[PDB]
Design a protein around this ligand. Structure first.
Ligand SMILES: CNCCNCC(=O)Nc1cccc(C#Cc2ccc(C(=O)O)c(SCc3ccc(Cl)c(Cl)c3)c2)c1
Length: 286
């Protein structure tokens, strides 16, 4: 569970894939239980005033790492958002891992972006997938929309084969004060089966990560629950940064660490194997 050299990592992937992928299963079972005895509380998440603010009853925001909204003129639970700070490579609180916002949380979502000085949104979901509602549209289709004291204008849209880039101009009405928020939206979701090819995800991760300018707030990352694909993106991004910097990889170690920050980050064994596949392709992209 120490940083493994890229060469050894490649050999370690082989060990994990053998014997009907049992090594991957053991690794993922180890991730699933790592915080079981830590008694990590999520009191604010379970408070009755905040229940309608959670997309899934069981997908909570740990107290110690939750993003707190700056108190709002009045309420006692106006500080709550189902969002957590998550570390990145050599950068504590490099991300805000959050659920896909609800119509009832659009204002909180945009206020958090404003208050956190977030300049990048990573959306790793379609609004609807396999006929199920995954996320609500928190942005205007065209032109301007107001979300509480936050005025949001769509400035531009650039559609690529696997992802869309939307630039927004945001401004707080009741208060620099006019800012650019760039949304990187991954759109390629296989209607049957599972991904498939890591190359488009690798390009999405690299281009969305390179867009992080100094000295801005954390990059907001969301999918539906804000755990599965969110954690997947966070592990890939951090690991590509470790590979470039030190030519080492620590998937298990870094994942077990981020599991203390938000529950269920990298939610399935499939996502866990996907990280390894994506990282192998990046290492090979030489
Ligand atoms: C005993 N059970 C295992 C046996 N079968 C072996 C097996 O599954 N291999 C295997 C081998 C290689 C990859 C996979 C996978 C996967 C997968 C499934 C569902 C989802 C999903 O959409 O949730 C995703 S997310 C992908 C993504 C998209 C965009 C971005 Cl931006 C990001 Cl970051 C991440 C990934 C599975």
């Amino acid at each position: 569970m120490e940083a493994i050299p890229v060469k050894q990592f490649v050999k370690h992937i082989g060990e994990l894939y053998s014997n009907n992928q049992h090594g991957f299963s053991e690794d993922f079972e180890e991730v699933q239980r790592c915080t079981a005895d830590m008694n990590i509380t999520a009191e604010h998440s379970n408070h009755p005033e905040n229940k309608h603010k959670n997309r899934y009853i069981n997908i909570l925001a740990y107290d110690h790492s939750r993003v707190k909204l700056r108190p709002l003129p009045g309420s006692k639970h106006s500080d709550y958002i189902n969002a957590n700070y998550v570390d990145g490579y050599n950068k504590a609180k490099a991300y805000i891992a959050t659920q896909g916002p609800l119509k009832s949380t659009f204002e909180d979502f945009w206020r958090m972006i404003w208050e956190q000085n977030t300049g990048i949104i990573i959306m790793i979901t379609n609004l609807v997938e396999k006929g199920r509602r995954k996320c609500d549209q928190y942005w205007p289709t065209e032109n301007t929309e107001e979300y509480g004291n936050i005025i949001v204008t769509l400035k531009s849209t650039k559609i690529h084969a696997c992802y869309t880039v939307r630039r927004f101009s945001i401004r707080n009405t009741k208060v620099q004060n006019e800012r650019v928020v760039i949304q990187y939206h991954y759109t390629q979701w296989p209607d049957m089966g599972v991904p498939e090819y890591a190359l488009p995800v690798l390009t999405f991760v690299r281009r969305s990560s390179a867009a992080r300018m100094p000295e801005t707030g954390p990059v907001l990352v969301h999918c539906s629950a804000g755990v599965g694909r969110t954690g997947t993106y966070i592990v890939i991004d951090s690991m590509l940064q470790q590979i470039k910097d030190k030519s080492t990889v620590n998937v298990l170690g870094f994942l077990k660490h981020i599991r203390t920050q938000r529950n269920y980050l990298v939610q399935t064994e499939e996502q866990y194997i996907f990280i390894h596949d994506a990282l192998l392709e990046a290492i090979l992209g030489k």
